[PDB]
Amino acid sequence: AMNVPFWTEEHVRATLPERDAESHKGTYGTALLLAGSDDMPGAALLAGLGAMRSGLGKLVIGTSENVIPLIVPVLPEATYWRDGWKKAADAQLEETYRAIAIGPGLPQTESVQQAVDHVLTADCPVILDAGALAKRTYPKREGPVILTPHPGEFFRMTGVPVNELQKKRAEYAKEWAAQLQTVIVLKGNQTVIAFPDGDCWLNPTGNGALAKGGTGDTLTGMILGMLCCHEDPKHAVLNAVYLHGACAELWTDEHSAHTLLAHELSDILPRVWKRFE
Amino acid sequence: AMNVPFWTEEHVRATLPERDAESHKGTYGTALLLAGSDDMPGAALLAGLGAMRSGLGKLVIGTSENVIPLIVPVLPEATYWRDGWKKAADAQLEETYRAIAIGPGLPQTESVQQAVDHVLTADCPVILDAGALAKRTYPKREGPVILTPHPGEFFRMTGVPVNELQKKRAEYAKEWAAQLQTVIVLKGNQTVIAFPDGDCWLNPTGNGALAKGGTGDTLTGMILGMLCCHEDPKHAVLNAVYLHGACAELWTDEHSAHTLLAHELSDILPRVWKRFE
Amino acid sequence: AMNVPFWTEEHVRATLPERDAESHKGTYGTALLLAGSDDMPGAALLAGLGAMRSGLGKLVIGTSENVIPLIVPVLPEATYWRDGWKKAADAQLEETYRAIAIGPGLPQTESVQQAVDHVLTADCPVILDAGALAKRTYPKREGPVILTPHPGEFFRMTGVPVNELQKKRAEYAKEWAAQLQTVIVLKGNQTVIAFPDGDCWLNPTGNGALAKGGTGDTLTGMILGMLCCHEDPKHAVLNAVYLHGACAELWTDEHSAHTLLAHELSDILPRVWKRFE
Amino acid sequence: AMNVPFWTEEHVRATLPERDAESHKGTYGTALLLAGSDDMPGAALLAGLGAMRSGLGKLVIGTSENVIPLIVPVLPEATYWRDGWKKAADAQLEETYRAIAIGPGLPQTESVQQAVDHVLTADCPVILDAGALAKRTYPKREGPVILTPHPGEFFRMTGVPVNELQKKRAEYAKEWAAQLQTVIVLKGNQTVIAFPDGDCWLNPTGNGALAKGGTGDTLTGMILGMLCCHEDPKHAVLNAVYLHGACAELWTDEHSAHTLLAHELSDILPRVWKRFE
Numbered sequence A, B, C, D: 001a002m003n004v005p006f007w008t009e010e011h012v013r014a015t016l017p018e019r020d021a022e023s024h025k026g027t028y029g030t031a032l033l034l035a036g037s038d039d040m041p042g043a044a045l046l047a048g049l050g051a052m053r054s055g056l057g058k059l060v061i062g063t064s065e066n067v068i069p070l071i072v073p074v075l076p077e078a079t080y081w082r083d084g085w086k087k088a089a090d091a092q093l094e095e096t097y098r099a100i101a102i103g104p105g106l107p108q109t110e111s112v113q114q115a116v117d118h119v120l121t122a123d124c125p126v127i128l129d130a131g132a133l134a135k136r137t138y139p140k141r142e143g144p145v146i147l148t149p150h151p152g153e154f155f156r157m158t159g160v161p162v163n164e165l166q167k168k169r170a171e172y173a174k175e176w177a178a179q180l181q182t183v184i185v186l187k188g189n190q191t192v193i194a195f196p197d198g199d200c201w202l203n204p205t206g207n208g209a210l211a212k213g214g215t216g217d218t219l220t221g222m223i224l225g226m227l228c229c230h231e232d233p234k235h236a237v238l239n240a241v242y243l244h245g246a247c248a249e250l251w252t253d254e255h256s257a258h259t260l261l262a263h264e265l266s267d268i269l270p271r272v273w274k275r276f277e
């Protein structure tokens, strides 16, 4: 009804970054991922793989001691801030990060909110997902805050019931991005990407292969990595959401949509991203 | 002798579900898998991979603390109910599940039977396999109970000796499905799928590549996932057994039947299932 | 000089077993693998993968508690006898196995020899490798004993110096197979397979891709599995040694011989074995 | 400005070693890798995979107890010296190694320098990387010492600021290789390989796919393995640096340069190395 435009293949091709010959890992920054807990460890691996696949320089994973060993053999390229998401509840970060994500596989607790409050004093884009999403307001800061709710999480954030939300997705997402002054990636078929300056887009990619545990955890990681290699954080968010869906569409060419596992999205991204270069 | 019909490719094609564009993981439900023990941990990974490959929305694995870390790196998409199969012995489940499986890699003990008794008070289909199979009766409930014995397990359940059973497989399977009022998937070459309402089918797929440890553990998982995406639980059971065998037949096109490992069935299923769409 | 014949492709094709449609895992037996220690854990994974790829029904791995978790995610199809190689030092095995292997990654100790002495009271073929190879004699028993030394291990077994051995490999291997009344698989380019009844063969397959840690550990496993699916244990040994080498020759078609990792031999075997069917 | 020649495909083809039919693992030696720590475990897996892929006979990894289990499932072919990098601080090595590398994922501490001092009393090539790089001098010894700094590490070693270094890379690398009497592999686009006898080369391979955490850890391992199979250690260093870059160039043919993970370099090397045979 609002005629929200799609972020199309043409926009993706025009905005994906180069990886220059005269670059090193520092050029692409160090990201921090605060994710994973004892009974939801896998979300950290999923988001970590999404992040490292998505063009960052380095990744530090701040997770519980028991989660670390479960990541290493699959994603040996990441390093660790031991019990980092718990530690983040106690103090401002002393390390400089290019971008930070918090929430996948974290319990939805006040301690996690304390960690969010500390991370927001950093000068970098911050993504809040999953257990880091709550009903709250956000401090004025320079770097964007990017919230990635599915409709259930949006209800938790706003009190807008899911059945009402789903009738007017872009309208609600835009209204709340404006009110909160955050980016809102309202997930679902035709994901809405609403910016607090009023810009808004729909994502045209993806299918029901994505309707399975873990896929949003992977997405959070993809956004985190893309924030590190794109000059414009808006493009990073839009390209992450687009390519995430494009990976599922590649899968379904020769595989049943019932059968995708989220980590395979990260495995598919290398070839999919090349197509748009 | 009874002229039991085969569940054929035509029946599979006619009954496999769509994965709608306007779905999310909740559409396809959360399954519970109660499996894996200290000296048989791998059965939990095998059944978990089968389940998550088979069209569910989410999977919770209730297994021993020592088993959890062995699953995560391979199947990061699952979450955990820590010591869940032991905990299930103590109380009705407070969580709602779309379908539940219990038994792979569980010791054949009275505590496991206590867990079975608690899970059966849930209102969902329940699969009993392996260490959860015993000589017993089943309470009247709305959701189907699906037993998945091989002939040795059927002897344990019924007292019918294996050598006698194997001469009259469909007759025994039908008789006992009726007596117990459970589904019985009596495994073997030409697996019998006997329903307590008298319907019965033979499975036409599979080969001796399946004659190796773990393959029945994978099957239990495949049934669990298919119960979550099929409207008719009968079709879910029949399609799981069929596709499980079809995966082994794909394998043997270019690989020796002596050399299959059960987890590869789950890896093959994506492409095999696409063929029937 | 003795004109020892090669075990050729024709002999392999004539002797590889069928996997019948009317078989189950029990048809192909349960093997026991006694392997792996705290600072050499990987040998257990290598031999376990070789075994399960090679046509057995089930595999029990008797290894240290700390080794178990390192196997499971890669070879979830195996089950465990916790601290089994240590436990085997204390008593005859109460379980019936189709075939047993002992030694890969085990320290070369008197306790391991105690375990060997207990395993030899079983009525099945037994393979001794690596840390289970010592200077000793063997009791009269029905099942074959198969020793798998490289030339260094043969020196340890016999006192024949390596430089002397390597000039007259088949002569020494035959002499000592006769004296000990064991099979001896004397490894190296042109591996010698010497039977205690005087039969002897050379293996024509393999290349320097195999000249790297772990490949003999994989071989022990391959022999173990092949003993479970071949009616004639002689053929099992000969086909294992042949196919092990054939896997390296496949690898080198498109990969450098400097770059093979032993576990990949197990990954290649499915396609290689199909070629000989 | 100095007209430093490139180490070209022709030089690689002329100097890569054969893997003879009449070789065994001992022919290619046992390497020691001292790498990996609790919050940087993955560097040990990365360097270990690079090493074992690169033509050694055996690899011993001296790492922390907590790191060992994270390597085994992915690189089962390696064995361990438990807490070896810490133990190396206390005494000369009693074991003979073909080549030794120290530093990836090790904290940059005086204890690591103590380990370096002990390893240098061995008679073999030694590679120092990462946490083993410090401002120091080196004792006269027969085997080469190979330092592998990126420009930040070179600043730490020398006091030459990065912005100055990067204007005159070959000049500085040559000057300091001469002063220290070590090989210096000064990383970056157009890596400089400077020998203490005055020979110097530029590497023509690689791209921004390498500008991500872990890739230098992999390289250290590749050098370690190549030192074991090349007769001339100069060629080993030059071929490792060249092939490492060539692997990234293969990747980018069909994958985006933003998306490479370092361990995949090791996975690509088998096919890339074959191209130069």
Ligand SMILES: NC(=O)C1=CN([C@@H]2O[C@H](COP(=O)(O)OP(=O)(O)OC[C@H]3O[C@@H](n4cnc5c(N)ncnc54)[C@H](OP(=O)(O)O)[C@@H]3O)[C@@H](O)[C@H]2O)[C@@H](O)CC1
Residues within 6 Å of the ligand: A039, A040, A041, A042, A043, A044, A103, A104, A105, A106, A107, A130, A131, A150, A151, A152, A153, A162, A187, A188, A189, A213, A214, A215, A216, A217, B023, B024, B025, B026, B027, B058, B076, B077, B078, B079
């Ligand atoms: N492997 C791991 O470690 C995994 C970890 N994970 C972690 O689990 C944590 C909890 O996150 P979660 O999303 O699983 O559960 P939760 O917040 O209760 O939301 C469900 C509610 O939202 C609703 N709803 C959602 N989408 C909707 C739509 N399109 N349209 C309509 N309704 C929609 C849904 O509605 P329903 O289907 O019930 O109608 C239900 O009410 C979090 O930390 C996450 O990172 C998971 O990613 C799993 C894999």
Ligand SMILES: NC(=O)C1=CN([C@@H]2O[C@H](COP(=O)(O)OP(=O)(O)OC[C@H]3O[C@@H](n4cnc5c(N)ncnc54)[C@H](OP(=O)(O)O)[C@@H]3O)[C@@H](O)[C@H]2O)[C@@H](O)CC1
Residues within 6 Å of the ligand: B039, B040, B041, B042, B043, B044, B103, B104, B105, B106, B107, B130, B131, B150, B151, B152, B153, B162, B187, B188, B189, B213, B214, B215, B216, B217, C023, C024, C025, C026, C027, C058, C076, C077, C078, C079
């Ligand atoms: N990796 C893991 O964690 C693994 C875990 N697993 C777990 O192990 C547990 C025990 O289950 P299991 O099936 O291994 O042994 P068990 O119940 O003793 O049955 C064998 C008996 O049945 C018979 N029999 C079977 N089929 C037959 C047929 N077609 N036709 C005829 N006879 C037939 C067979 O006969 P036989 O060959 O002796 O004549 C023998 O008497 C269970 O929890 C399972 O999940 C396993 O899946 C292994 C991988």
Ligand SMILES: NC(=O)C1=CN([C@@H]2O[C@H](COP(=O)(O)OP(=O)(O)OC[C@H]3O[C@@H](n4cnc5c(N)ncnc54)[C@H](OP(=O)(O)O)[C@@H]3O)[C@@H](O)[C@H]2O)[C@@H](O)CC1
Residues within 6 Å of the ligand: C039, C040, C041, C042, C043, C044, C103, C104, C105, C106, C107, C130, C131, C150, C151, C152, C153, C162, C187, C188, C189, C213, C214, C215, C216, C217, D023, D024, D025, D026, D027, D058, D076, D077, D078, D079
């Ligand atoms: N990942 C793991 O867990 C791994 C574990 N492993 C475990 O390590 C344990 C020790 O076994 P191992 O074979 O590594 O050492 P060891 O018995 O000292 O033998 C070397 C001696 O033999 C000689 N020699 C050998 N072949 C020869 C030939 N063709 N021709 C001539 N000489 C020959 C060689 O001679 P050299 O080269 O010194 O002249 C040297 O003297 C064992 O339990 C094994 O399973 C390994 O498999 C590694 C991967």
Ligand SMILES: NC(=O)C1=CN([C@@H]2O[C@H](COP(=O)(O)OP(=O)(O)OC[C@H]3O[C@@H](n4cnc5c(N)ncnc54)[C@H](OP(=O)(O)O)[C@@H]3O)[C@@H](O)[C@H]2O)[C@@H](O)CC1
Residues within 6 Å of the ligand: A023, A024, A025, A026, A027, A058, A076, A077, A078, A079, D039, D040, D041, D042, D043, D044, D103, D104, D105, D106, D107, D130, D131, D150, D151, D152, D153, D162, D187, D188, D189, D213, D214, D215, D216, D217
């Ligand atoms: N998965 C794991 O276990 C991993 C483990 N690892 C381990 O981490 C440890 C620390 O090593 P590290 O290289 O990450 O950090 P560090 O020494 O602080 O160097 C950065 C400094 O150097 C500079 N700089 C570098 N290149 C440059 C260039 N071309 N041109 C210009 N400047 C350049 C850079 O400059 P900047 O970008 O800031 O301008 C910054 O100042 C080590 O043990 C390693 O093995 C890592 O490999 C990660 C994966």
Ligand SMILES: Nc1ncnc2c1ncn2[C@@H]1O[C@H](COP(=O)(O)O)[C@@H](O)[C@H]1O
Residues within 6 Å of the ligand: A150, A187, A188, A189, A190, A191, A205, A206, A207, A208, A209, A210, A211, A212, A213, A214, A215, A216, A217, A219, A244, A245, B020, B021, B022, B023, B024, B025
């Ligand atoms: N049917 C669908 N079509 C397109 N995208 C979907 C579909 N189902 C799920 N997704 C995407 O999958 C992810 C689910 O996130 P979450 O529930 O946090 O795991 C989001 O990126 C969704 O937009």
Ligand SMILES: Nc1ncnc2c1ncn2[C@@H]1O[C@H](COP(=O)(O)O)[C@@H](O)[C@H]1O
Residues within 6 Å of the ligand: B150, B187, B188, B189, B190, B191, B205, B206, B207, B208, B209, B210, B211, B212, B213, B214, B215, B216, B217, B219, B244, B245, C020, C021, C022, C023, C024, C025
């Ligand atoms: N020879 C065979 N032909 C067809 N299916 C088989 C064969 N051997 C085993 N299977 C199947 O493999 C599984 C074995 O289950 P289980 O013994 O519980 O692991 C069941 O699905 C069997 O029907």
Ligand SMILES: Nc1ncnc2c1ncn2[C@@H]1O[C@H](COP(=O)(O)O)[C@@H](O)[C@H]1O
Residues within 6 Å of the ligand: C150, C187, C188, C189, C190, C191, C205, C206, C207, C208, C209, C210, C211, C212, C213, C214, C215, C216, C217, C219, C244, C245, D020, D021, D022, D023, D024, D025
């Ligand atoms: N150059 C080679 N040619 C053929 N086979 C080889 C070669 N080097 C090693 N092997 C085989 O690799 C294995 C090495 O065993 P081991 O030393 O116990 O790991 C044996 O099967 C050897 O016969």
Ligand SMILES: Nc1ncnc2c1ncn2[C@@H]1O[C@H](COP(=O)(O)O)[C@@H](O)[C@H]1O
Residues within 6 Å of the ligand: A020, A021, A022, A023, A024, A025, D150, D187, D188, D189, D190, D191, D205, D206, D207, D208, D209, D210, D211, D212, D213, D214, D215, D216, D217, D219, D244, D245
């Ligand atoms: N843009 C680039 N072009 C070529 N090689 C690169 C590039 N960025 C990084 N590398 C290589 O990647 C490795 C980085 O090492 P390090 O920082 O120790 O992980 C070295 O081998 C670098 O020369």
Ligand SMILES: [Mg+2]
Residues within 6 Å of the ligand: A129, A130, A150, A216, A217
């Ligand atoms: Mg989510």
Ligand SMILES: [Mg+2]
Residues within 6 Å of the ligand: B129, B130, B150, B216, B217
């Ligand atoms: Mg079973």
Ligand SMILES: [Mg+2]
Residues within 6 Å of the ligand: C129, C130, C150, C216, C217
């Ligand atoms: Mg050996």
Ligand SMILES: [Mg+2]
Residues within 6 Å of the ligand: D129, D130, D150, D216, D217
């Ligand atoms: Mg480095």
